[PDB]
Design a protein around this ligand. Sequence first.
Ligand SMILES: Nc1nc2c(c(=O)[nH]1)N[C@H]1C(S)=C(S)[C@@H](COP(=O)(O)OP(=O)(O)OC[C@H]3O[C@@H](n4cnc5c(=O)[nH]c(N)nc54)[C@H](O)[C@@H]3O)O[C@H]1N2
Ligand SMILES: Nc1nc2c(c(=O)[nH]1)N[C@H]1C(S)=C(S)[C@@H](COP(=O)(O)OP(=O)(O)OC[C@H]3O[C@@H](n4cnc5c(=O)[nH]c(N)nc54)[C@H](O)[C@@H]3O)O[C@H]1N2
Ligand code: SF4
Ligand code: SF4
Ligand code: SF4
Ligand code: SF4
Ligand code: SF4
Ligand code: SF4
Ligand code: SF4
Ligand code: SF4
Ligand code: SF4
Ligand SMILES: [Mo]
Lengths: 734, 193, 193, 250, 250
Amino acid sequence: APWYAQEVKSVYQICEGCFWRCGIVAHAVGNRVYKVEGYEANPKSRGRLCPRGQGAPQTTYDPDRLKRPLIRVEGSQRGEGKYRVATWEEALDHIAKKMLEIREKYGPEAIAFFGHGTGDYWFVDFLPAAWGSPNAAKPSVSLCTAPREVASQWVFGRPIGGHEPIDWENARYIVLIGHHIGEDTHNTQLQDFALALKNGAKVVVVDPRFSTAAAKAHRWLPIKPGTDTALLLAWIHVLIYEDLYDKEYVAKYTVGFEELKAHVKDFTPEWAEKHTEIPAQVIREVAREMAAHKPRAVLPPTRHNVWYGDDTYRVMALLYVNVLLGNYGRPGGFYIAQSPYLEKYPLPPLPLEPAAGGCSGPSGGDHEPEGFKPRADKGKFFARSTAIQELIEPMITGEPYPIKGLFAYGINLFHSIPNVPRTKEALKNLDLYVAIDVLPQEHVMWADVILPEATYLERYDDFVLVAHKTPFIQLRTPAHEPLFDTKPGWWIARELGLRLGLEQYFPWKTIEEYLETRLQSLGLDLETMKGMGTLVQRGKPWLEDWEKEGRLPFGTASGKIELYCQRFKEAGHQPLPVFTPPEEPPEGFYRLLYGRSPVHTFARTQNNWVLMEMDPENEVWIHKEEAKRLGLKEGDYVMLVNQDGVKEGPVRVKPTARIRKDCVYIVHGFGHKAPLMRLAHGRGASDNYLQTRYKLDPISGGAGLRVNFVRLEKAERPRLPSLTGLAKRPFDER
Amino acid sequence: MPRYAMAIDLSLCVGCAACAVACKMENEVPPGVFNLWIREREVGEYPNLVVEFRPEQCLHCENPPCVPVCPTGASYQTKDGLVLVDPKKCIACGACIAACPYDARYLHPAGYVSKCTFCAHRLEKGKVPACVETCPTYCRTFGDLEDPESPVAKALKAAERVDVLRPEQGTRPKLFYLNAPSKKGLTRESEVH
Amino acid sequence: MPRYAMAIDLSLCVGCAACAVACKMENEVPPGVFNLWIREREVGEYPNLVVEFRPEQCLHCENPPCVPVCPTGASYQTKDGLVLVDPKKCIACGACIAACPYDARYLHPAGYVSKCTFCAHRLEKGKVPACVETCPTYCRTFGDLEDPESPVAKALKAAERVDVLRPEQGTRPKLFYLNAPSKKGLTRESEVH
Amino acid sequence: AEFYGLPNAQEFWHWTNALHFVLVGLAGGVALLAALLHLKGDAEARRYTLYALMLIALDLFILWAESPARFRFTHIWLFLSFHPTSPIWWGAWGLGLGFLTGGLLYLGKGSQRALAWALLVFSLVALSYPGLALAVNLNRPLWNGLMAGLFPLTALVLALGLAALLKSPWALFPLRVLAGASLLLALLYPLTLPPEARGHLLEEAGFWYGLFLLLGLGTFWQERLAPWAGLLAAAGLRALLVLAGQWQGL
Amino acid sequence: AEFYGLPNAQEFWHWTNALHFVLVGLAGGVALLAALLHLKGDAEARRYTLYALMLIALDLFILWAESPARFRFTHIWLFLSFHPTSPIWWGAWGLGLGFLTGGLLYLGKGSQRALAWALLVFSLVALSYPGLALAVNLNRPLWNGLMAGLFPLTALVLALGLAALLKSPWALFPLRVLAGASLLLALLYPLTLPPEARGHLLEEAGFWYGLFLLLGLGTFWQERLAPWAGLLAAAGLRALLVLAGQWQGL
Ligand SMILES: Nc1nc2c(c(=O)[nH]1)N[C@H]1C(S)=C(S)[C@@H](COP(=O)(O)OP(=O)(O)OC[C@H]3O[C@@H](n4cnc5c(=O)[nH]c(N)nc54)[C@H](O)[C@@H]3O)O[C@H]1N2
Ligand SMILES: Nc1nc2c(c(=O)[nH]1)N[C@H]1C(S)=C(S)[C@@H](COP(=O)(O)OP(=O)(O)OC[C@H]3O[C@@H](n4cnc5c(=O)[nH]c(N)nc54)[C@H](O)[C@@H]3O)O[C@H]1N2
Ligand code: SF4
Ligand code: SF4
Ligand code: SF4
Ligand code: SF4
Ligand code: SF4
Ligand code: SF4
Ligand code: SF4
Ligand code: SF4
Ligand code: SF4
Ligand SMILES: [Mo]
């Protein structure tokens, strides 16, 4: 009866639990992965796994998990949930037919491709460019990481990347700005953070909320929200003006350090304390303590940075502090992450190729005369990244041309993009909207054609390359074959690719064919790759390795500390003066903060019975004294109403103090209105549905989310089905 | 011959229920029940705010009240210190549930009572328990308490403080909490409101 | 209106019995009975020997079981948290001795129950207790728990760990043992045999 | 305060079992009546034995019909082993042997005083094991020592209350004595608890409790209300303690 | 394990307060017999009302006699303060109002048989208070919840034992009923304690304990052995529990 006593088959497999993509071993018995585990060699899991990784397999064995292709009954409105089963053949034809029509009277740029997850390579990076649409985007860019990636491209010549390059194990002093580690449960960084703590790494957390990471911190600075740049500028000021910075480091690897010293003249700990609300002594002490530890003092940059409209400034400032400490590329906090060598599968160049911009004109030069039609959000902000949230307008007004048609490859349109009413207007106006997913979420059931993807355990994917101290390559192998009528994304892409004239792209007849080519290059084949799931290559990490070779890494030959001559020029400001006092909550309201549940990924795990059973709802954090003035107590429920009147389904109130009185916090990803995901439907409040407005970062396409205010209105406890009852529905592969 | 135990460092625990989900998965624990769960409690106001994350599960008490009270002999303590259930004798009378002070046991839907097993199945084949293996923070340790080299033994030896739940029942838990966050020790509901 | 308390830093207590003797002299506590006594216990085995020197006395519990039990009303709890006996109403029935969990109470040979008094007589004249005064090792502190300038308050804040005897009882002892020498906390006789 | 997953702190003994608890009271106490009757050589000894047998049968049937392992047929282990430390084990053997002992009594086979003393001893085991099934769980603050007192006395109010409805003339006096005992100990029970446990009993129950205390007082009033009132107080009290005492609570 | 000075862990209620425990058992038990005999109209209601007044008075004297506070006359406060939380306080009034009440009943005046209701109430308070005066001390492992049951049961064994020796026809049967209830709870008591508390009890007393249990089995044999044997059993247990439970212990 127990799975482990029963015959097993293991395979080396990547976790699709989230984007960290940990290398895992999957233990299947027949057609079912009973257990998954990290493995030692893999530099991401190293034998461990976070809760999401452990529970991730049940979506594959979820009775509501999407099985057949589906097409929207003709004449029924998008939203209304009327579908009819279809054949992969019929669904795939229907999509190409429609896509082609959009392309004959509007051009291929009238098709937006949104997507996320491993297979976003096919949908967001590859298919769109092979098709000729620059309107390809992922929420991990303007709804996550854009502010820091831009900041980093301008300051260093490099990205921060998906596996942020912090040398945690040698770090001695760590400053976390909103970075919640332990709630944000990215495997390796949890491990590393924990090892740092373990070796006597003292951690400072700056956050208006006393988070998990704060629970492990030597200092908690309960910063007034949207005020971090003032604290960062004042620390910059203390390391420059008290002369604590790493002089040599700036001398040999830094351009324009002088502009920064003068800029930061008046931003004193007393100026900071006034806006920041952190006492001036504390501001000083923290900068001194970090200077005392250099180069082994790091402010690792957080991943979710859209917080407010100004965001790239805050990150730039955080990076200056790291530079001033001399930590980049030294053991202590930033090792140099090099990408592994795995040669691409040989193909003709793509109609549109990317511009990994950072300097000397990476905006719209290729967009202006260069061929056709530029990404539809081209003039909205300075940076060159595609911003998912800005290309949605074009679908409603037809402004910058028209975007009819939209693909949603594993991307939560209604939870990951703000202003859900606007996104629904935009799906209304579309000629084609396809969504490739696994569960019947609220935004999948607004599609003309739903295509059920095969899940990470039933699927091969193109390799996963991770830039790292020791770059590596990972390979996921099916643990068993797809279930029902389920197809891998490589296959769906190829099958659409053949149907829209892109055979030169997609030539290989099979993914193992594809995978054997890249393995050839490196000196192996498919079977051997399956043998050592992950492949580590030699690279570099500090500056010496670079330096002795007579080179340096960057963008232009010396990190430019103020950080970017060509923004200055035509955009207006170079330095991060925009501490820009943030608009404040109206009285009766609270700033809506949000974040992660250690056990749930974004939104997609809300139907997972193993994980929902660990955390079946979110909970609104209000200061104990506010819930008391309000008449709210421990088990009460409440509706969240934002400044624009949107109400978010009843949420449990959490009157325990670990938060300022200015704010309110809820974990992101609950509040599904998606009846077909039977155990995620009707639970918690959705932060996104309350995030009606956003402040566009004019520098890094980011949509500042923490600009929404919410007030609480007493509500009744909700009456919902029993989760155990639902969780007990047997999984039948029919 | 060994005396099996588990040590969890609370100074490192962040309450990401990884261990709880890994056990759910490894042991196929049905939906409404749990061999392992995490409790999280805050203690205190603004300038002294402590949060305790605490996984709770059979402590494999050395003096288990959950054994003598069993009518059939299904509930038994092993020579190495494991408290287990021979489902073949279990009549699901719930005596052991009444007697366990830690809400560590449940009625499995197959008609017998269940609970954390210290992954006896893995132990027997020389492996460490599922909770122990999947744990980002490396705060749990396991081993023979009698072997000075074992990871629990070491963990206990290096601990700043060691605590056990409801020590005043006299069960002698063999799941040790290291370095509790609060000065006053493990958090109790009674020290709240 | 304050909350009177005593803290004893066991990391510094050497169990010389100075406080105990200073008490006996001051309060002229009669032969055979003690407001304060020292308990010394070894927790053992060479590389890991630990000796706990622990002075014991009325903890002036915040929720004293010895008060409610009194028929007379002689056992009363004061507005600042001292448990005292008014010997005028005491009928020397022992109910309070029966209800005291700490053996802090005795029958005075003058026919009424007595026990440590937090040196009430000194507290009103604005002085610190006699045991607190004599302490060579500076390990005991006193004051109003609510005044953060208090020596108890500051010590509680500085303690690495804070313990109390029989917390499982109702009482809320207001005598805090600070840095307990054994990792498992305050020594108990059941933990020996 | 917050959990990931949940501790298994839910009710393990349901209304179903609380019923078993009221019944084994009746069973055991009627077996005591039958034993003491055989022993006085009184004529009613025979039908009280039938009843004690019936209530023993009815109680083993609902102990089995309510067992999650009712179809796994594992209760046989109850009888193939020796677990003297376990109240439920005692209970199984007392009733069981008490049902054989009372079986032979009914069938005038295998002796008859030596069988009536046996019935006496087994019916004391069966009257004794429920309060101890509760009371050995020192982690449950409501199931304190008095449960070992409340349950035997209450099992007697049930048997005698029944005996009196069946109009046996000897019983309406013992019923009032034993009901007075039970109600006095039941009234002092909450006062025997730590404050938080008493407060827990009062919040979750009480008003029921206090109603069962009043009710039982009608055992000393009108002649034919007296057994009903005594029966319902004693059964209400037994079931309420079984349901409300499943708490570990800090 | 080693001390400088000593904890005041010395016995606090000595053999004399174990003697009062036995008498207030009687005093309260007989006061109950009296009021019930009143209420019932019985010819003997007077005989037993003046006994209860002596037993009550004997105890209240032994209560002051054994108090080191006797010649300080502080007992007046027992009657000039309101202290409902205190078992002993309740027993001061229960035996005090129980006295006046039994006076106004024996001197046939101020009122009749509305006064027997008050005597019944005060006797229940007097029967209840010791049992709770022990059990209220939750720091004493041996004095668990069963004390609140073992003492009132045992006080009536004392009252009915006396009554049966003064050859009242009614007394034997209820004495052998409450004596069975008493003896069975007394047997279950050890099994109710935690293992260290029980171990303490069996090494400290027990024999003594198992003697009085055996001795008490004598209520169910002959007469003029019976009331004696049940009376020595009830007072054995009562005195021994007061003596052996003054332990705090870890
Ligand atoms: N309001 C708000 N918005 C946010 C955030 C926030 O905190 N608040 N966080 C932002 C951040 S930081 C990020 S990184 C993004 C992430 O945003 P998303 O990745 O869009 O988030 P999820 O909610 O997991 O949505 C995943 C969707 O992909 C589907 N899916 C999952 N696995 C597979 C698969 O193998 N194949 C296919 N085809 N589909 C799959 C899921 O069912 C679901 O529809 O969201 C961002 N958006
Ligand atoms: N379990 C789990 N872990 C995940 C994910 C998941 O879905 N589930 N997703 C992953 C992804 S893609 C991302 S992007 C991250 C998201 O996680 P992070 O990258 O760590 O996000 P942050 O927004 O930095 O941190 C959230 C914290 O920011 C705080 N905050 C809000 N406003 C301010 C402010 O003005 N100043 C300061 N200093 N702090 C503020 C909130 O209080 C909260 O405590 O986590 C990742 N890890
Ligand atoms: S971080 Fe956790 S959820 Fe994400 S891929 Fe790794 S194991 Fe899966
Ligand atoms: S896996 Fe580690 S961090 Fe997660 S709950 Fe268990 S002990 Fe805590
Ligand atoms: S429920 Fe099963 S394991 Fe527990 S006491 Fe009963 S028979 Fe034993
Ligand atoms: S933790 Fe529970 S199952 Fe384990 S020995 Fe203790 S009572 Fe028994
Ligand atoms: S040791 Fe075994 S029973 Fe315990 S949590 Fe880990 S897997 Fe579950
Ligand atoms: S003065 Fe200090 S060391 Fe000496 S007996 Fe008192 S508490 Fe102990
Ligand atoms: S001895 Fe004195 S102080 Fe103690 S309970 Fe009796 S009257 Fe009260
Ligand atoms: S320690 Fe004992 S005597 Fe002192 S106040 Fe507390 S309960 Fe009363
Ligand atoms: S406070 Fe006073 S009475 Fe108490 S121990 Fe110290 S000197 Fe003695
Ligand atoms: Mo993200």
